Amino acid sequence: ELTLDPDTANPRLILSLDLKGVRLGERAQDLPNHPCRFDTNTRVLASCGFSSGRHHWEVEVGSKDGWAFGVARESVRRKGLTPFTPEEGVWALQLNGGQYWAVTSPERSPLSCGHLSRVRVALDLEVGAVSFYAVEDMRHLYTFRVNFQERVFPLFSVCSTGTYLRIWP
Amino acid sequence: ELTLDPDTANPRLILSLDLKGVRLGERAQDLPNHPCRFDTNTRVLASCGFSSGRHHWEVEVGSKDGWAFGVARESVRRKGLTPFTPEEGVWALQLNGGQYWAVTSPERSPLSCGHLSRVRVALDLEVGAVSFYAVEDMRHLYTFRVNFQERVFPLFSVCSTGTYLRIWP
Ligand SMILES: NC(=O)CC[C@H](NC(=O)c1cccc(Oc2ccccc2)c1)C(=O)O
Ligand SMILES: NC(=O)CC[C@H](NC(=O)c1cccc(Oc2ccccc2)c1)C(=O)O
């Protein structure tokens, strides 16, 4: 079962008591400056990452703008504002402008998928893929094909108040 | 009376003979590595920038994704991949995903303006604003309000083949 890693979380994020949920707050928490902590970008990783095999989880997503989630390679940079892009080691979907995106670069890719409530993330480290599905009807949203070469962690980001992400059984 | 400054242009850009038009090509031109040149982001400035008063120009825009334009402060960073954001000195509209945006951060602002062919940029360095209008019917698209404190240059960016920007009388 995944849980969010509080040592990675940007200090403006609020992690739920059960460490499954994240939203953005107004307060910058006073937290230890661990190297694994995202000090500027509004990100948090799960506590455990994967090096091989197939793994899946589900993310409950808010209806309002401001979230992005998927996976990141461990070496994703933690300090400073870093780009949210595949080149920088993040493979994610995002909600911005009432629209859903795969965060490709330099052009984001529109999904045109309609409203999402819960998304299944399927990480395949044998093939080198990460895929996203809408849980309601399992329609395929997006797949990134990647030559993963290190440990890969579930990634969550919430850069606006009023939305959330939550890991769901 | 604006022209694009070839010394600023990313080497993958193609500037028109009259230095009014820009598109992205496949070839990295062999150009001098002037400090003013954008070496990675797909940007070019006009040759002249403004420190006071009101100035306007028009930009013909392609229908396909990949452009952004507006204004940039002179101090906009030219080297490396740098964020395309107000905090980094760029105030711009963008076409990305069949969607028009004002490039706010951390969330882009959708314009929901319908198809654009030509856009008037009105830079007001007395008030501290840059505004964008659709030329068809002069409807107001967006205004950034900024405490400008240095010379501000017209900015153009084309990060995908198949689209263009052109300065229009
Ligand atoms: N959630 C998403 O859609 C992914 C984008 C996300 N953006 C940022 O983190 C970002 C980008 C620019 C400024 C910025 O600064 C702030 C810091 C504290 C609170 C609010 C904004 C934060 C990320 O890269 O993970
Ligand atoms: N026009 C726009 O919508 C503005 C965004 C624009 N993006 C980039 O420049 C960018 C962003 C990431 C990678 C990248 O690399 C490339 C280099 C050569 C050709 C293609 C892409 C370029 C910018 O910041 O001006």
Cβ distance of B159 and A108 shorter than 8 Å: no
Q: Show Cβ contacts of residue B114 under 8 Å, excluding neighbours closer than 6 positions.
A: none
Ligand 1 atom closest to the Cα of residue A43 is 25
Tokens read off for A48: 């455990």
In a domain, A1, yes or no: no
Cβ contacts of A96 on chain B, cutoff 8 Å? 107-108
Structure-determination technique: X-ray
In a domain, A123, yes or no: yes
Q: Show Cβ contacts of residue B137 under 8 Å, excluding neighbours closer than 6 positions.
A: none
Cβ distance of B108 and A97 shorter than 8 Å: yes
Cβ distance of A97 and B81 shorter than 8 Å: no
DSSP class of residue B59?
A: E
Q: Which residues is A167 bridged to in the sheet?
A: A59
A159 lines ligand 1 (CB under 6 A): yes
What resolution does the deposited structure have, in angstroms?
A: 1.6
**DSSP strand pairing (A129-134 vs A140-145):** antiparallel
Cβ distance of A81 and B83 shorter than 8 Å: yes
Cβ atoms of B111 and B141 closer than 8 Å: yes
Alpha-carbon distance B43 to B72, whole Å?
A: 10
Q: Show Cβ contacts of residue B91 under 8 Å, excluding neighbours closer than 6 positions.
A: B70, B71, B72, B103, B130, B144, B146
Cβ distance of B159 and A42 shorter than 8 Å: no
CATH code assigned at A94: 2.60.120.920
Cβ contacts of B66 on chain A, cutoff 8 Å? 106-107
Distance (Å) from the alpha carbon of A97 to chain B's nearest alpha carbon: 5
Alpha-carbon distance B57 to B121, whole Å?
A: 5
In a domain, B4, yes or no: no
Phi, psi of A88 (to 5 degrees): -90, 0
Look at residues A86, A77, A17, A1 and name the one whose alpha carbon lies nearest to residue A43.
A77
Sign for the pseudo-dihedral over CA of A157, A163, A164, A169? negative
Query: Which chain A residue has the Cα nearest residue B107?
Result: A96
Other CB atoms within 10 A of residue B51 CB: 11
In a domain, B36, yes or no: yes
Ligand 2 atom closest to the Cα of residue B82 is 24
Burial category of B107 from C-beta neighbours within 10 Å (exposed 0-12, middle 13-18, buried 19 and up): middle
Report the number of distinct structural domains present in chain B.
1
Ligand 1 atom closest to the Cα of residue A84 is 24
Alpha-carbon distance A76 to A135, whole Å?
A: 28
Structural domain for A23, as ranges = 13-168
Chain B residues interacting with chain A (CB cutoff of 8 angstroms)? 42, 65-66, 81, 83, 96-99, 101, 106-110, 159-160
Distance in Å, CA A82 to ligand 1 centroid: 9
In a domain, B8, yes or no: no
DSSP class of residue A27?
A: S
Distance in Å, CA A45 to ligand 2 centroid: 27
In a domain, B1, yes or no: no
Q: Residue-wise over A68-107: b if at least 16 C-beta within 10 A, else e?
A: bbbbbbeebebeebbbbbbebbbbbbbbbbebbbbbeebe
